[PDB]
Design an enzyme around this catalytic site. Structure first.
Site, PDB file in Angstrom:
ATOM      1  N   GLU A 701      -7.924  17.305 -27.086  1.00 43.00           N
ATOM      2  CA  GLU A 701      -7.434  16.092 -26.460  1.00 43.00           C
ATOM      3  C   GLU A 701      -7.389  14.950 -27.470  1.00 43.00           C
ATOM      4  O   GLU A 701      -6.423  14.193 -27.493  1.00 43.00           O
ATOM      5  CB  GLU A 701      -8.303  15.717 -25.263  1.00 43.00           C
ATOM      6  CG  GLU A 701      -7.847  14.474 -24.527  1.00 43.00           C
ATOM      7  CD  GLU A 701      -8.563  14.295 -23.206  1.00 43.00           C
ATOM      8  OE1 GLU A 701      -8.583  13.161 -22.677  1.00 43.00           O
ATOM      9  OE2 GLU A 701      -9.109  15.291 -22.684  1.00 43.00           O
ATOM     10  N   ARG A 779     -17.244   9.785 -15.209  1.00 45.42           N
ATOM     11  CA  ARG A 779     -17.019  10.961 -14.400  1.00 45.42           C
ATOM     12  C   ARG A 779     -18.345  11.524 -13.922  1.00 45.42           C
ATOM     13  O   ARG A 779     -18.492  11.807 -12.723  1.00 45.42           O
ATOM     14  CB  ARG A 779     -16.194  12.031 -15.090  1.00 45.42           C
ATOM     15  CG  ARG A 779     -15.884  13.185 -14.122  1.00 45.42           C
ATOM     16  CD  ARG A 779     -14.864  14.131 -14.638  1.00 45.42           C
ATOM     17  NE  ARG A 779     -13.528  13.579 -14.471  1.00 45.42           N
ATOM     18  CZ  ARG A 779     -12.810  13.684 -13.350  1.00 45.42           C
ATOM     19  NH1 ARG A 779     -13.314  14.308 -12.284  1.00 45.42           N
ATOM     20  NH2 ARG A 779     -11.600  13.144 -13.297  1.00 45.42           N
ATOM     21  N   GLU A1160     -10.399  22.483 -14.026  1.00 41.09           N
ATOM     22  CA  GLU A1160     -11.827  22.157 -14.236  1.00 41.09           C
ATOM     23  C   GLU A1160     -12.770  22.321 -13.037  1.00 41.09           C
ATOM     24  O   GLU A1160     -13.964  22.590 -13.224  1.00 41.09           O
ATOM     25  CB  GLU A1160     -11.961  20.714 -14.702  1.00 41.09           C
ATOM     26  CG  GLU A1160     -11.265  20.395 -15.971  1.00 41.09           C
ATOM     27  CD  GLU A1160     -11.273  18.912 -16.221  1.00 41.09           C
ATOM     28  OE1 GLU A1160     -10.476  18.225 -15.542  1.00 41.09           O
ATOM     29  OE2 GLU A1160     -12.069  18.435 -17.080  1.00 41.09           O
TER      30      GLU A1160
HETATM   31  N1  XAX Z   1      -6.457  29.350 -20.741  1.00 37.75           N
HETATM   32  C1  XAX Z   1      -6.790  28.041 -20.677  1.00 37.75           C
HETATM   33  N2  XAX Z   1      -6.996  27.440 -19.478  1.00 37.75           N
HETATM   34  C2  XAX Z   1      -7.356  26.116 -19.431  1.00 37.75           C
HETATM   35  C3  XAX Z   1      -7.449  25.279 -20.675  1.00 37.75           C
HETATM   36  C4  XAX Z   1      -7.329  26.075 -21.923  1.00 37.75           C
HETATM   37  O1  XAX Z   1      -7.437  25.486 -23.138  1.00 37.75           O
HETATM   38  N3  XAX Z   1      -6.937  27.372 -21.856  1.00 37.75           N
HETATM   39  N4  XAX Z   1      -8.262  24.041 -20.588  1.00 37.75           N
HETATM   40  C5  XAX Z   1      -8.728  23.550 -19.284  1.00 37.75           C
HETATM   41  C6  XAX Z   1      -8.858  22.033 -19.220  1.00 37.75           C
HETATM   42  S1  XAX Z   1     -10.070  21.252 -20.074  1.00 37.75           S
HETATM   43 MO1  XAX Z   1      -9.601  18.960 -20.115  1.00 37.75          MO
HETATM   44  O2  XAX Z   1      -9.937  17.378 -18.842  1.00 37.75           O
HETATM   45  O3  XAX Z   1      -8.462  18.467 -21.727  1.00 37.75           O
HETATM   46  S2  XAX Z   1     -11.834  18.573 -20.364  1.00 37.75           S
HETATM   47  S3  XAX Z   1      -8.335  19.671 -18.224  1.00 37.75           S
HETATM   48  C7  XAX Z   1      -8.011  21.291 -18.470  1.00 37.75           C
HETATM   49  C8  XAX Z   1      -6.777  21.909 -17.841  1.00 37.75           C
HETATM   50  C9  XAX Z   1      -5.523  21.176 -18.295  1.00 37.75           C
HETATM   51  O4  XAX Z   1      -4.356  21.842 -17.846  1.00 37.75           O
HETATM   52  P1  XAX Z   1      -3.727  21.582 -16.349  1.00 37.75           P
HETATM   53  O5  XAX Z   1      -4.643  22.368 -15.444  1.00 37.75           O
HETATM   54  O6  XAX Z   1      -3.743  20.081 -16.171  1.00 37.75           O
HETATM   55  O7  XAX Z   1      -2.368  22.181 -16.573  1.00 37.75           O
HETATM   56  O8  XAX Z   1      -6.598  23.303 -18.157  1.00 37.75           O
HETATM   57  C10 XAX Z   1      -7.827  24.037 -18.124  1.00 37.75           C
HETATM   58  N5  XAX Z   1      -7.529  25.471 -18.244  1.00 37.75           N
HETATM   59  O1  LIG Z   2     -11.242  10.891 -15.884  1.00 37.47           O
HETATM   60  C1  LIG Z   2     -11.050  11.946 -16.543  1.00 37.47           C
HETATM   61  O2  LIG Z   2     -11.401  13.089 -16.151  1.00 37.47           O
HETATM   62  C2  LIG Z   2     -10.402  11.845 -17.881  1.00 37.47           C
HETATM   63  C3  LIG Z   2     -10.069  13.024 -18.536  1.00 37.47           C
HETATM   64  C4  LIG Z   2      -9.472  12.917 -19.773  1.00 37.47           C
HETATM   65  C5  LIG Z   2      -9.226  11.667 -20.366  1.00 37.47           C
HETATM   66  C6  LIG Z   2      -9.541  10.449 -19.752  1.00 37.47           C
HETATM   67  C7  LIG Z   2     -10.133  10.508 -18.491  1.00 37.47           C
HETATM   68  O3  LIG Z   2     -10.476   9.344 -17.855  1.00 37.47           O
END
Ligand code: XAX
Ligand SMILES: O=C(O)c1ccccc1O
Ligand SMILES: Cc1cc2nc3c(=O)[nH]c(=O)nc-3n(C[C@H](O)[C@H](O)[C@H](O)COP(=O)(O)OP(=O)(O)OC[C@H]3O[C@@H](n4cnc5c(N)ncnc54)[C@H](O)[C@@H]3O)c2cc1C
Ligand code: FES
Ligand code: FES
Ligand SMILES: [Ca+2]
Lengths: 1225, 67, 30
Positions: A701, A779, A1160
């Site tokens: 990120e 969070r 998540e």
């Molecule tokens: N295979 C796979 N699945 C995964 C990811 C991954 O790298 N690989 N990462 C997570 C994270 S961690 Mo974060 O808030 O940047 S802490 S949110 C997030 C999430 C982001 O992707 P959407 O669900 O919004 O499309 O994917 C999830 N599923």
């Molecule tokens: O609120 C969140 O979960 C969050 C996640 C990624 C970056 C900024 C954010 O506030």
């Protein structure tokens, strides 16, 4: 004057006239042969991303054999006349896919896809040896293959369907390699040059050369020599040539155990046990026996067994030959054996066990250090004929000193004693004394180690006695899965290099906190292909970077953590850049460092002031409470372990500051922004392109910019394209992980279990910059309630400023930490009230329409249904009885069961990030190109966006395509984060599609029987634009800390998980028996994708809470830097029975086509394993500790074998077994 | 590039200035309407203040134009 | 406002220095 290296790749002859001894197979495949299916995931043998098949003629055993190997560790100089098969070798989408490839793709066994080629090759290699494998053989094939995404279940399910010679000389830049053909040659060479290093499997030498910085200018590989490969049956035992692979040893010994009578095979079964959970197939097929013995590691699993059994070693040099049995004198000191420098180990005779002779081997279920402090042992007893009188006793231990040792004084005291209770007592007293550890002993874990030395002996004592007496809603596979399985999917480092492309290596602080006095590059300057060393002065724009502008791109006058980036080397090859970097000398003057949360608190070292959420009247809630419980809890951090590490390519154009970058990132906008700011150039000059990542998990990120900006500077400075892909050890050290949390808490509750008051002070370890630490803590506070109504509540949070790598986003973003602290005090309430845990949790739950502690109303609150449903499908009540029955009948093994709910808020907690753009073109053949701000990291975002577009446009998916994410198609994009990407890009794509439909409408009207292509052509010829943007903005968001009101989240995702574990109370090991999950995701856009997310998130959570342990020196330097010392879940880690259900009939009005975020929310359910472990420990303690049923004992996360074992307080942990007084009947 | 502007006519017939000129002008107007409320709230501000404030208020700073 | 002004071709200086990239000036892949 060097010989030609001749080998085969996928059927094709390779002739390499200038073979460098230092070149790995993985490097050659990727950078000479252009075959980039095979991946780099660690370079140390643990991950299997680099798996290939190798075929060679065993002249001896007389057959072509096929086996798997780690290409990252195979010297090409070992490969003369060997055939290599890679993922490309077996099939592809351009011809035909192999069944293995098709199968893993269609079974949803591939998400990010980065591990998939390695797994394909493991399975393929299995099938080439055994066309009809058992389930056991299939699972065993994957022991050396790691997947971070899937949770493993779908890969095993999917594959279930398959069940039932002259001397050569090579000369490199630095190394001369001799492939010896005969024993004579070997002995002669070693006499001419005694310093020459032998290499067989290179699985130890490779590590020394790459990670430990050794250089052996002359190498002799003796693999071809027949005497080093003989297997010989003798009257005394079975002899193995020193070059024999562990897999040959395993196979020979298994055949002996099946054939011979039990009484002859006690030692063989010791050997086999140590080989059981030992690396994987790749390592076992290339590691030699003698390699392990002569490496002489303190934590060698084999040396203790050989020593305890008097395994005979035949040792040879020119003229000389001797055969000694292995005893305590064979290892005089650290990493040394009793051979002269001319001597080579020839063979190893492993003995048959005699009459009245018994043997056991055991090993510690954790490893936290590179070569120390992992307890492993061999134990042997010989009695007088037909008696129980000890004639011989050997107890040999690894991981209790800097070498394999024998408990000589203890065992010698036992000669002629009888095998009874008194002997048990005498041996334990001796062991605790003779092997005692000073409290500052290297490796730590003092209590645990001592405990295991005794408990392993107890297990041996007991064993000896016994021996005596519209596709929306459809489960569509990931659109890229086939190409991921075939190795055709392109990741950042798979993009070909420009002829003029250069390579960057970061130069990194080796101190936690210090002045940088000077930097000297004169040794690096001597490295062939050196181009330049870069530092803070080379920056044309600004050295000020990071989300809150509190970081340097390159360290200026001080360093503030181990791994703080000081500079960079650019060179013509990555190996040259690596060598030159290691040799850049930095002069430091140390400064007072602050490392732990406790350090930070003691020194008031924080970013900003206390964050707080508070509701009700606390002194008052506590007044009314029947019971008040306070305590403190810690939860350790976590490393992302995306199989693909960070990577950036930077292409400087040479005009107007323009630069094009390809980067493994969740955040194209910040990458673009940071790079522009570094270069001193308008954002409109910089282009960032993201095709896909091999995993991100939050770690990409923000922290991807550490590499991106540096590579960009190199590109600017040189005028050449430049790239960098991090090694695993660099990636874990520099890029930050999950925030560790410390909690100080107090709960007031009634006799009933009803909570009446809560105060929690949270402290996070933030590291050496802000990054997302403040948002992460928000969070956390938003989730300190989990699913429970708390009338009087106060949560504080403090961010600890420390000399550690800056911690960042990780799947859950602070929630799992807060939720874990919640369930911890909740578990203590239940035990204190002496009521069933599920009753206490149920009673305290929110109802439909309740307000949270931050005053947001819970509407569509489905926790009760998930709970109800999980209770029933998991058969919770029945099994609970079964668990009690089991515990009443077992003394040294206990079971535990727990059911846990979760709620998780959906939205970015920064309101302005909840925005999303799309861009759509329809071309004149009617094909459609969709672009949106989200990135693909394996979660199947693009798959979901194609399904949404196809539904919105009313056309087949086959007419729609998503190519990549880019800053010149959709600008100002939020990071792909917070689980909302489906929600927000789903909506943006939808809108763009509506616009396109409105424009085609008059043409559908003029011609309603026309195809899509007719209408598209007709609008084109009427000059109607077929390109549009779409945009979405999450409505009604805006929480205020000062008024404690406004919505923090759009909605909540809910779920409930029940898990059952069995603990080994004597060792701290455990097996996950069963997990049932019921998750509320609304109406799923894609049940296959969503279940995959539930499964993968859960397994990451179980990693966090039970397996993953980062460990640092007192001085703040990371010790755990690869898979060998940091354990993520493996194939063998998951629940034997692993069931996931999606809650039916629960549409979500808030989001696209009634779906909900899934990324998540389910990670925390992983904690059900943790609380099941705690449940089981509780039973172990009622067994051996005290009789207080309302005892509260602390248990921190992760619940590793150490913490589990130390909590099972018994006659061993207390040393009561020695005759000493202590705590326990 | 074909992935930023699809289905374009060849740069031909001397009309590129006339036609791409209008399309660029129309995309500019759209951006101006979008920034207007922010200009009005802070009339003494710079271009950059308006853009940031738009972004922070979740107003899209990307548009097509057509003629 | 430069509309109506004799503004030089924006890329001319780069064209004079041989920094302006044409198709074949793009670097080749290895
Ligand atoms: N295979 C796979 N699945 C995964 C990811 C991954 O790298 N690989 N990462 C997570 C994270 S961690 Mo974060 O808030 O940047 S802490 S949110 C997030 C999430 C982001 O992707 P959407 O669900 O919004 O499309 O994917 C999830 N599923
Ligand atoms: O609120 C969140 O979960 C969050 C996640 C990624 C970056 C900024 C954010 O506030
Ligand atoms: C992923 C992974 C997991 C592992 N897990 C375990 C584990 O769980 N338990 C455990 O005990 N080990 C483990 N190992 C260690 C492994 O067993 C050794 O690295 C391997 O057996 C060494 O053999 P090699 O043929 O690769 O030796 P090389 O690396 O080629 O050589 C190792 C050393 O032995 C010397 N040598 C080799 N043959 C001779 C000879 N005949 N005479 C004199 N010197 C010789 C070499 O000079 C060198 O110094 C693991 C290794 C990896 C990579
Ligand atoms: S890269 Fe070879 S084992 Fe991980
Ligand atoms: S799919 Fe296995 S690591 Fe991502
Ligand atoms: Ca931080």
């Amino acid at each position: 004057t060097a010989d030609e290296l001749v080998f085969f790749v996928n059927g094709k002859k390779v002739v390499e006239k200038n073979a460098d001894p230092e070149t790995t197979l993985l490097a050659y495949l990727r950078r000479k042969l252009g075959l980039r299916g095979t991946k780099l995931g660690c370079g140390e043998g643990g991950c299997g991303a680099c798996t290939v098949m190798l075929s060679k003629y065993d002249r001896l055993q007389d057959k072509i054999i096929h086996f798997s190997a780690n290409a990252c560790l195979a010297p090409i100089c070992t490969l003369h006349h060997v055939a290599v098969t890679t993922v490309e070798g077996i099939g592809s989408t351009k011809t035909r896919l192999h069944p293995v490839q098709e199968r893993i793709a269609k079974s949803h066994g591939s998400q990010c896809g980065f591990c998939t080629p390695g797994i394909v090759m493991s399975m393929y290699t299995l099938l080439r040896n055994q066309p009809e494998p058992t389930v056991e053989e299939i699972e065993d094939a994957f022991q050396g293959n790691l997947c971070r995404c899937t949770g493993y279940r779908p890969i095993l399910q999917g594959f279930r369907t398959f069940a039932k010679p002259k001397q050569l000389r090579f000369e490199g830049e630095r190394v001369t390699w001799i492939q010896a053909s005969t024993l004579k040659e070997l002995l002669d060479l070693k006499a001419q040059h005694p310093e020459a290093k032998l290499v067989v499997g290179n699985t130890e030498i490779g590590i020394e050369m790459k990670f430990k910085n050794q250089l052996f200018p002359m190498i002799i590989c003796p693999a071809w020599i027949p005497e080093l490969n003989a297997v010989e049956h003798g009257p005394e035992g079975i002899s193995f040539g020193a070059a024999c692979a562990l897999s040959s040893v395993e196979k020979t010994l298994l055949e002996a155990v099946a054939k011979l009578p039990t009484q002859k095979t006690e030692v063989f079964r010791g050997v086999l046990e140590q080989l059981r959970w030992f690396a994987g197939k790749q390592v076992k097929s290339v590691a030699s026996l003698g390699g392990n013995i002569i490496t002489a590691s303190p934590i060698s699993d084999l040396n203790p067994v050989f020593m305890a059994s008097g395994t005979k070693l035949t040792i040879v040099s020119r003229g000389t030959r001797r055969t000694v049995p292995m005893d305590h004198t064979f290892f005089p000191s650290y990493r040394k054996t009793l051979l002269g420098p001319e001597e080579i180990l020839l063979s190893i005779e492993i003995p048959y066990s005699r009459e009245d002779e018994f043997f056991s081997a055991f090993k510690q279920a954790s490893r936290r250090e590179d070569d120390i402090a992992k307890v492993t042992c061999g134990m042997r007893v010989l009695f007088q004929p037909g008696s129980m009188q000890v004639k011989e006793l050997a107890l040999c231990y690894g991981g209790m000193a800097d070498r394999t040792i024998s408990a000589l004084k203890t065992t010698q005291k036992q000669l002629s004693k009888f095998w009874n209770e008194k002997l048990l007592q005498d041996v334990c007293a001796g062991l605790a004394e003779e092997l005692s550890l000073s409290p500052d002993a290297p490796g730590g874990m003092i209590e645990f180690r001592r405990t295991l030395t005794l408990s392993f002996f107890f297990k041996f004592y007991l064993t000896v006695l016994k021996k005596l007496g519209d596709t929306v809603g459809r489960p569509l596979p990931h659109l890229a899965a086939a190409m991921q399985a075939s190795g055709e999917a392109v990741y950042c480092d798979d993009i070909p290099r420009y002829e003029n492309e250069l390579f960057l290596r970061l130069v990194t602080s080796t101190r936690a906190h210090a002045k940088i006095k000077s930097i000297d590059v004169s040794e690096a300057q001597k490295v062939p292909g050196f181009v330049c060393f870069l530092s803070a002065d080379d920056i044309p724009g600004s050295n000020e970077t990071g989300l809150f502008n509190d970081e340097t791109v390159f360290a200026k006058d001080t360093v503030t953590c181990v791994g703080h980036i000081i500079g960079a080397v650019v060179a013509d090859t990555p190996e040259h850049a690596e060598r030159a970097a290691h040799v850049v000398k930095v002069t430091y003057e140390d400064l007072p460092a602050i490392i732990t949360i406790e350090d930070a608190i003691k020194n008031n070292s924080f970013y900003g002031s206390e964050l707080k959420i508070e509701k009700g009247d606390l002194k008052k809630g506590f007044s009314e409470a029947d019971n008040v419980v306070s305590g403190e809890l810690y939860i350790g951090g976590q490393d992302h372990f995306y199989l693909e590490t960070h990577c950036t390519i930077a292409i400087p154009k040479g005009e107007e500051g323009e630069m094009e970058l390809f980067v493994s990132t969740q955040n194209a906008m910040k990458t673009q922004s940071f790079v522009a700011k570094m270069l001193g150039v308008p954002v409109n000059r910089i282009l960032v392109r993201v095709k896909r990542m091999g995993g991100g998990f939050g770690g990409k990120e923000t922290r991807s910019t550490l590499v991106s900006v540096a590579v960009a500077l190199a590109a600017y400075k040189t005028g050449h394209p430049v790239r960098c892909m991090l090694d695993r050890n660099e990636d874990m050290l520099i890029t930050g992980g999950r925030h560790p949390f410390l909690a100080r808490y107090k709960v007031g509750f009634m006799k009933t279990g009803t909570i009446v008051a809560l105060e929690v002070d949270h402290y996070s370890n933030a590291g050496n910059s802000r990054d997302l630490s403040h948002s992460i803590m928000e969070r956390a506070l938003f989730h300190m309630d989990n699913c429970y109504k708390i009338p009087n509540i106060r949560g504080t949070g403090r961010l600890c400023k420390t000399n550690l790598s800056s911690n960042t986003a990780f799947r859950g973003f602070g929630g799992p930490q807060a939720l874990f602290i919640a369930e911890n005090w909740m578990s203590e309430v239940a035990v204190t009230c002496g009521l069933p845990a599920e009753e206490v949790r149920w009673k305290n739950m929110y109802k439909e329409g309740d307000l949270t502690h931050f005053n947001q109303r819970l509407e569509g609150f489905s926790v009760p249904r998930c709970w109800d449903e999980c209770l029933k499908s998991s058969q919770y009540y029945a099994r609970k009885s079964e668990v009690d029955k089991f515990n009443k009948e077992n003394c040294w093994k206990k079971r535990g069961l727990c059911i846990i709910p979760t709620k998780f808020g959906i939205s970015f907690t920064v309101p302005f990030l909840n925005q999303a753009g799309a861009l759509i073109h329809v071309y004149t053949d009617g094909s459609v190109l969709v672009s949106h701000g989200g990135t693909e990291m394996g979660q199947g975002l693009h798959t979901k966006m194609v399904q949404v577009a196809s539904k919105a446009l009313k056309i087949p998916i086959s007419k729609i395509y998503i190519s990549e994410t880019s800053t010149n198609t959709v600008p100002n994009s939020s990071p792909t984060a917070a689980s909302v990407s489906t929600d927000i890009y789903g909506q943006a794509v939808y809108e763009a599609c509506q616009t396109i439909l409105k424009r085609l409408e008059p043409f559908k009207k003029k011609n309603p029987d026309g195809s899509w292509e007719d209408w598209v052509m007709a609008a084109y010829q009427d000059r109607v634009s077929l390109s549009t943007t779409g945009f979405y903005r999450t409505p009604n968001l805006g929480y205020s800390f000062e008024t404690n009101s406004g919505n923090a989240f759009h909605y909540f995702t809910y779920g409930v998980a029940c898990s059952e574990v069995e603990i080994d109370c004597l060792t701290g090991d455990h097996k996950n028996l069963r997990t049932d999950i019921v998750m509320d995701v609304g109406s799923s856009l894609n049940p296959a994708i969503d279940i995959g997310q539930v499964e993968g998130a859960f397994v990451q959570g179980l990693g966090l809470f039970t397996l993953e342990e980062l460990h640092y020196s007192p001085e703040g330097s990371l010790h755990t830097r690869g898979p060998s010392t940091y354990k993520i879940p493996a194939f063998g880690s998951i629940p034997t029975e692993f069931r996931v259900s999606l809650l039916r009939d629960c549409p979500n009005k808030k989001a696209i086509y009634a779906s909900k975020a899934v990324g998540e929310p389910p990670l925390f359910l992983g904690a059900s394993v943790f609380f099941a472990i705690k449940d089981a420990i509780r039973a172990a303690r009622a067994q051996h500790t005290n009789n207080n049923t309302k005892e509260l004992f602390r248990l921190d996360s992760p619940a590793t074998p150490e913490k589990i074992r130390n909590a099972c307080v018994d006659k061993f942990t207390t040393l009561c077994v020695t005759g000493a007084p202590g705590n326990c009947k």
